[PDB]
Amino acid sequence: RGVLQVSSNVLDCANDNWWCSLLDLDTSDWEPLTHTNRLMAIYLSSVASKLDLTGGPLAGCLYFFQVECNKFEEGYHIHVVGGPGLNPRNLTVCVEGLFNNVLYHFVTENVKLKFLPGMTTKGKYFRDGEQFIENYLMKKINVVWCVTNIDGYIDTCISATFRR
Amino acid sequence: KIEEGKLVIWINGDKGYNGLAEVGKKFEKDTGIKVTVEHPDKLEEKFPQVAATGDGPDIIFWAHDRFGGYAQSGLLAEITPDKAFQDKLYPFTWDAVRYNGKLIAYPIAVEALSLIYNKDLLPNPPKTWEEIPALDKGLKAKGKSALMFNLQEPYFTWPLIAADGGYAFKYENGKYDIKDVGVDNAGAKAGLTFLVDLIKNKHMNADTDYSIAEAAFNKGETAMTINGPWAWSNIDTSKVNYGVTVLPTFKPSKPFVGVLSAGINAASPNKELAKEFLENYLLTDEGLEAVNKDKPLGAVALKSYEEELVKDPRIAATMENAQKGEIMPNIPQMSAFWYAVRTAVINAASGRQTVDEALKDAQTVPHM
Ligand SMILES: OC[C@H]1O[C@H](O[C@H]2[C@H](O)[C@@H](O)[C@@H](O)O[C@@H]2CO)[C@H](O)[C@@H](O)[C@@H]1O
Ligand SMILES: [Zn+2]
């Protein structure tokens, strides 16, 4: 598990390829979106889509994405929660590559994201993503958007009703 | 709601909560403190959600696998039983409740699924799983069915799944390696493929749950079920002449062994009242006795009363199954395991996924 920071600048650099998608943002059980909130939805949805048909180390992986407002700065952070061939030695590079390659098409300047992997106090990578999802991310209601391919959270992750 | 000077005790609905209440009334008697005993649904998920800030209970009862999570999130008070008391209980039982050097709950009893058969409908219960299809066809002829047990909770399915080599986390040098899951090895894939095929071949129905199979067996519409000790009170009431025996082999079935434990909410004011109730009213010969008489506990962690319970052929059948299974880990990753193999089991029985897909998934889930 980790986090990617998304500065306010990244949203300023958005282009029309980013904004003009009809993709189904199902807000029937959610809260409405603001233009930059909707930008994060569309990004998460499209990173998810590209992940689904991405090979190499990321083949066959399970993922949980969640984008929130930064509470004390402008901008957003994305929560990212594994798979075979996904290990501590390639995890950062593979997660940065996935997200930068989708975003490259959506911004008017060169912008790169950085992935900060959740570590223990004893310097070890965290390997609790699932109880993280279960005990933290699904309890937020403060949560802008969320996409996942993990069975059982596929429907509930964009339920306001459930999280409540 | 919790209050200073009163005890609130949660405990699951299949166990002898009434008999525990009788122990709380004896406690109320001797001290003036009212005990109340409550059996909510899903209490192993309700407690972590409300213990810190909401209305948690004073004392919480469950198998020892969930406490590692609780004590990591710090929802749990220390326990302080002295050497004199520690000696009254079995060394292995105190091990199941020891987490990061510290005892984090009061052990109570040892649980393990067994095979429960209807002697009238089946005088020689099958020793092997593979005999079960043939036995279900010879029993569908007579108007019955060979076997029905709860297929929703992975607790029941697992024994078959670990039989040929499935496991949760690789236990090596006293330490569970959470990097090393074995839910997708050959031996697990075989265990589960056998279970799905029993559903394809109409020998079991993927929709069967705890309520449905307890009714089929307690009414005599099936010859066999899989269940733990708590289940014998209602079978006694139904007059079925039953027997409790070793679980079928596959290709022994290793069940995961539970130690029913009591923990103490960090949000209790009555941490010393709880400690007195458990050490001096419940984990006594009479106290355990009062609970066992409502719904059996299995093999109690108190030596002095386990010595009488084990003369019961059923309790030796349960310890037999326990010796072939494994003590559940307690580490916090165990809720992520149980999440992963519950999903795979329900998706492969219902057809939503193949055995190979649904196990490739629950291989990644528990150690992201
Ligand atoms: O179903 C997975 C389940 O396994 C264990 O739950 C058992 C428990 O040991 C028994 O006391 C009994 O009442 O039935 C339960 C099955 O629902 C684990 O304790 C639990 O964490 C896990 O979810
Ligand atoms: Zn956050």
Residue by residue, DSSP assigns B99-119 as: ETTEE-SEEEEEE--EEEEET
Enumerate residues preceding breaks in chain B (C to N > 2.5 Å). Answer: 251
In chain A, how many domains are there? Answer: 1
Distances (CA, A) of A18 to A7, A147, B52, B97, B309: 16, 17, 43, 53, 69
Which resolution in angstroms does this entry have?
3.4
DSSP category for residue A12: H
Contact in structure between A106 and A17 (CB atoms under 8 Å):
yes
Rounded Cα distance between B237 and B184, Å, is 41
Residue B362's CB: how many other CB atoms inside 10 A? Answer: 25
Give catalytic status of residue A136 as yes or no: yes
Residue A107 lies in a domain: yes
Nearest-CA residue for atom 2 of ligand 1: B155
Confirm or deny that A79 is annotated as ligand binding: yes
State which residue of chain B sits closest to A139, comparing Cα positions. Answer: B49
B330 contacts chain A (CB < 8 A): no
Contact in structure between A118 and A103 (CB atoms under 8 Å):
no
Rounded Cα distance between B72 and B348, Å, is 32
Q: Do B360 and A150 touch (CB under 8 A)?
A: no
In chain B, what residues touch A84 (CB-CB under 8 Å)? 363-364
Nearest-CA residue for atom 4 of ligand 1: B155
In chain A, what residues touch B336 (CB-CB under 8 Å)? 128, 130-131, 134
Neighbouring-strand partners of residue A107: A14
The listed CATH number (3.40.190.10, 3.30.70.1560, 1.10.40.50, 2.50.20.10) that belongs to domain B114-254+333-367: 3.40.190.10
In chain B, what residues touch A81 (CB-CB under 8 Å)? 368
Return the CATH number of the domain spanning residue range B6-111+258-327: 3.40.190.10
**What one-letter code names the amino acid at B346?**
I
**What one-letter code names the amino acid at B210?**
Y
Contact in structure between B330 and B102 (CB atoms under 8 Å):
no
If you count residue pairs, one on A and one on B, with CB atoms under 8 Å apart, how many are there? 53
Residue A42 lies in a domain: yes
Residue A77 lies in a domain: yes
Is B63 near ligand 1, meaning CB less than 6 Å away?
Answer: yes
Contact in structure between A118 and A126 (CB atoms under 8 Å):
yes
Which domain range does residue A103 map to?
Answer: 2-148
Confirm or deny that A105 is annotated as ligand binding: no
The span from the first CA to the last CA of chain A, in angstroms, equals 24
Q: Which residue in the list A63, A125, A136, A153 is annotated as catalytic?
A: A136
Task: State the residue for tokens 């069975």.
Answer: A151
Say whether B114-254+333-367 and B6-111+258-327 share the same fold: yes
Residue A23 lies in a domain: yes
Residue A155 lies in a domain: no
Q: Which of B132, B191, B196, B123 is nearest to B163 (CA)?
A: B191
